[PDB]
Amino acid sequence: GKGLGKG
Amino acid sequence: SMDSKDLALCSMILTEMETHEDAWPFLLPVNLKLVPGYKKVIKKPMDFSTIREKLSSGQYPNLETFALDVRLVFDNCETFNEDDSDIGRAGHNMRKYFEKKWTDTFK
């Protein structure tokens, strides 16, 4: 899950 | 507060941004319940509809405060999205468009 973004 | 001319200029530029083909990610607030991580890392969310409401309700005392919020939209986008993502590239394109429009208006 770790990290940013809207995928 | 801003006089009628300054309010009209802000509204005009905001409308040009709202109708741009690359505005799609920025028209409404990010839904903080449906976009995990966003609330955690983006301390001051901002979007065009919110800017419109702030403008209409007299929350911008001057041109500079309006421009700061527009830029905040793009600064947030740069943090949260990869530069090469569709949204990342939309944000960079919108920033370029805004800065040109802003410079062409007040030069």
Residue of B nearest to A4 (CA): B80
* Alpha-carbon span B26 to B84, nearest angstrom: 17
Residues in chain A: 7
Q: Give dist(CA A3, CA A1) in Å, integer.
A: 7
Which of B55, B57, B30 minimizes the C-alpha distance to B41?
A: B30
Contacts of A6 in chain B (CB under 8 A): 35, 80-81, 85, 87
Task: Kindly report the three-state secondary structure assignment for every residue of chain B.
Answer: CCCHHHHHHHHHHHHHHHCCCCCHHHCCCCCCCCCCCHHHHCCCCCCHHHHHHHHHCCCCCCHHHHHHHHHHHHHHHHHHCCCCCHHHHHHHHHHHHHHHHHHHHHC
Closest CA to B94 of B76, B65, B71: B71
Taking a C-beta distance cutoff of 8 angstroms, is the pair B22, B69 a contact?
no
CB contact under 8 A, B41 and A6: no
Resolution of the coordinates in A? 1.6
User: Within 10 Å of residue B104's Cβ, how many Cβ atoms?
Assistant: 9
> Are A4 and B79 within 8 A, CB to CB?
yes
Give the domain B1-107 fold: Histone Acetyltransferase; Chain A (1.20.920)
Indicate the domain borders of chain B: 1-107
Closest A-chain CA to B88: A5
